[PDB]
Amino acid sequence: NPDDIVVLVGRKKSGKSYLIKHYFIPVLKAHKISYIIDDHNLGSEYSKFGYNATSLSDIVSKQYVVVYDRAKNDDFFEKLWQASKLHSKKYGTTVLIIDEAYYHFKYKQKVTPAIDEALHANRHAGLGLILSTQRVYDLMPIVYKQADLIIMFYTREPNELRWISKYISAEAAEKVKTLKQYHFLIYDVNSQTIKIHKPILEHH
């Protein structure tokens, strides 16, 4: 699980960050698994969850880190990835949590060596991924093939349902339409199963 690739999908205010904060992170902390949060702002809702990294070296050396990913050079992801791997050598298996995945895994973008490694060899690299995004069709289709879990909140948008049907599951597409707010569908890509989950309140 800690080295799984998990994708979270849903429009703004679906409850993705609340899931991160009260469903994923508490579970990681209970198992003493470290994490690196990549948040695209220059003051971030995640500031209480880790050290405010100002350099790549903070990413490597601090156990719990929040990366302020704004105004970085165009090749920032490969640097973040390098630093995260080095972080993992120091702290063991680590989860890289990406608040808006389209910045680094956008549909139709060039597949770089860092992207290839993150999608095809992340376990060996010692890094799990939580990729959060607003619209299903904003990410490279390979993300969905390589994911272990795809978590989806409500949508009735036809082009999104089309994507879900094509790259995930036709049954998932049907059920996502009737989700009530804060409920979410969990699609296990490995077992090809679907579980509908009740709203999260707090970790127990």
CATH number at residue 93: 3.40.50.300
Question: How large is the greatest C-alpha to C-alpha distance in the chain, in angstroms?
Answer: 46
Query: By what method was this entry solved?
Result: X-ray
How does DSSP classify residue 99?
S
Instruction: Provide the resolution (angstroms).
Output: 2.0
Instruction: Report phi then psi at 139, rounded to 5.
Output: -105, 155
Tell me the residue type at 199.
P
Q: How many CB atoms are located within 10 Å of the residue 39 CB? A: 20
Instruction: Mark the binding-site residues for Mg(2+), compressed into ranges.
Output: 17, 45
Decide: residue 118, CB within 10 A, 0-12 exposed, 13-18 middle, 19+ buried. buried
Task: Please tell me the total count of domains within the chain.
Answer: 1
Residues in CB range of 55: below 8 A, 6 or more apart: none
Question: What gap in Å lies between CA 55 and CA 197, rounded to an integer?
Answer: 38
Instruction: Mark the binding-site residues, compressed into ranges.
Output: 13-18, 38, 40, 45, 69, 104, 182, 200
Measured CA to CA in angstroms, residue 55 lies from 18, 79, 101, 184 at distances of 27, 11, 21, 36
Range of the domain at 117: 1-204
Instruction: Mark the binding-site residues for AMP, compressed into ranges.
Output: 13-18, 182, 200
Residues in CB range of 13: below 8 A, 6 or more apart: none
Instruction: Mark the binding-site residues for Zn(2+), compressed into ranges.
Output: 38, 40, 69, 104
- Give rounded-to-5 percent helix, strand, coil for the chain: 40, 25, 35
